[PDB]
Symmetry: C5
Subunit: 114 residues, 5 copies
């Protein structure tokens, strides 16, 4: 597997606008909400769950990176894999998207699989 | 279990006003006090204990996130489970509330379960 | 044991004024000096030593918390257990106090045991 | 092996201009892009992969250091070993350069091997 | 062993002016350069190597504390043990000094062994 697999999806020129940390079924997790830097479109929501999904190994790196980009408010590219979380109340509150990568998009092009 | 279970409690539009770190029964722990961003109402006190309660797996994530929101002063929703801690002097000093989640809040929304 | 045991000592409305990191007898350690926010009294010195004393598990959390409170200069309550470190040259340079807790302070109270 | 081995390459007076975090083959990884502080020349891209290459032990230290230099915008020397990554879609998105070191730069000389 | 032993050396009223991270012999390492806050004297160079020397247990604490004082720019006392590193290319790039302690300095004194 790779963040850049064509079976994953991404959204460019986004800003991380909200951050949540919690626990589910023994696993700490976090979710983020992103919106278009320019105010258009519909929010993207994605979550990472410790020790859950094939993306578990990157949980801490992604949590730290989401925090960094959340604090700067800079434009970024969000990489997700759809339809991963199945807990229905969790999905209704957040989404089924697993967060699988984060890329800066500084005044050029987003620096990630494209 | 889940942060968002309706058997937990939450308080929206709060700011983390105080922070404490210590140790109990060989466990590092921390506590936070939150108040409404507008100053109304009664403070909420909640703690996390690294090796105790079903919420122990999220100790480090919650500590880091509480430290972050404390440093920014921004509005949050705090999620707790009531009636968890049992050492009477500890409960007298802080509360029986276990901290189980933290969500950032906009002016109109909080990004977490409700 | 507990930070809040009445056999420990604490000092309210202190500012962390100095910070030192070193190694002793295979153990990284840190020491802080604190002085009353209003100028009265005598400095307090306390240290935490990795993998040494009953307070060992808290070493990392306390070091991180002391760094933060040191960086802000805010008024804190420092909790110690006296007469723990016995290395006489160490003691003479620093103190025999083990650091066992740190609490933020408001105008009227500090957020921790008393 | 050593960051400073003469079989590695380095580029002085660079500014980290992009940062990317993801996962590949069960391993967290990050990539950075740097450009000459004066705008001449062409960008340098290098990546670290937490579980891969002889440089894996330094993954966390390099990621932490990269994030700090990225946040300051200061001029740095980036040290790489060429021709390490082999997955073609990864190489063509980023490069085959393994990141092996990062040095601050004085106004006249960078603090590291040359 | 102790940071404060007779056989170690120290330099007061310094500022950490440069920082380098790398890897050698499978071990992450870092080096710092310090200069007198008042511009006088000769710079001090010292390194820490994760799996090497009797000071290896303090690697991460010294890294974090070096990074802290580097970002604040405040004046410090740097403690070293001389003639530790032996690989000639490394010593000639950096120094044979092992970093063994860091102490905050006020205008009149430093908070550490002397
Ligand atoms: C640039 C211009 O002249 N006019 C833009 C127009 O290009 C906008 O269309 C988007 O532009 C951005 C530029 O970075 C992207 O190219 C975007 O493509 C993606 C994206 O990177 O966000 C590709 C992505 O594809 C994949 C395989 O993941 C799309 N994701 C999915 C699941 O399909 C997303 C997604 O559709 C969008 O992000 C919105 O959700 O787009 C272009 O679509 C256009 C957008 O309003 O406005 C002009 O100003
Ligand atoms: C409520 C129920 O369904 N059954 C109760 C059960 O909860 C009672 O309480 C726990 O019993 C266990 C023994 O199996 C423990 O004694 C526990 O005490 C501690 C603990 O060691 O876990 C003491 C601890 O105090 C200190 C100084 O650390 C408490 N920590 C704090 C911060 O207060 C913890 C903590 O409250 C719990 O671990 C949270 O889950 O509890 C008892 O609370 C049990 C016996 O008293 O009987 C049942 O009927
Ligand atoms: C070299 C050989 O003996 N036979 C070749 C062989 O090149 C092809 O197999 C690939 O090439 C070698 C075989 O060991 C590489 O090790 C590579 O393995 C990885 C690895 O898992 O370590 C693949 C990995 O790709 C992914 C998606 O993770 C590479 N990672 C990246 C970011 O590119 C790493 C990495 O390059 C090295 O670990 C660097 O040290 O190598 C094998 O997949 C084989 C066709 O499969 O053809 C033979 O001729
Ligand atoms: C203006 C005036 O009235 N007096 C100063 C006078 O204080 C100077 O003496 C130096 O002052 C600084 C104050 O922090 C230090 O005390 C310095 O001593 C050390 C030091 O702490 O840096 C002690 C150290 O000793 C040991 C055993 O490590 C010395 N290190 C070594 C390996 O020998 C270092 C080192 O020699 C210096 O830091 C410079 O590299 O000095 C006092 O020497 C006095 C001379 O500077 O001039 C007046 O201005
Ligand atoms: C009695 C006699 O003949 N020699 C001893 C001897 O024990 C000491 O010399 C060390 O002994 C072995 C021989 O290699 C060590 O391996 C050491 O080499 C390294 C090491 O691997 O630990 C090499 C290393 O170089 C690299 C590229 O990693 C050195 N690291 C650096 C950054 O220079 C380290 C390092 O210098 C030491 O580990 C620090 O403790 O050493 C030989 O140096 C000799 C002291 O050097 O004392 C004699 O009694």
């Amino acid at each position: 597997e790779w963040t850049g697999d064509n079976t994953n999806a991404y959204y460019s020129d986004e800003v991380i606008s909200e951050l949540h940390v919690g626990q589910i079924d023994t696993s700490p997790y976090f979710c983020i909400k992103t919106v278009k830097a320019n105010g258009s479109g519909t929010p993207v929501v994605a979550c990472a769950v410790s020790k859950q999904s094939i993306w578990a190994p990157s949980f801490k790196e992604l949590l730290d990176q989401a925090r960094y980009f959340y604090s700067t408010g800079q434009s970024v590219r969000i990489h997700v894999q759809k339809n991963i979380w199945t807990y229905p109340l969790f999905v209704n509150t957040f989404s089924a998207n697993a967060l699988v990568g984060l890329s800066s998009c500084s005044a050029t092009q987003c620096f990630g699989p494209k």
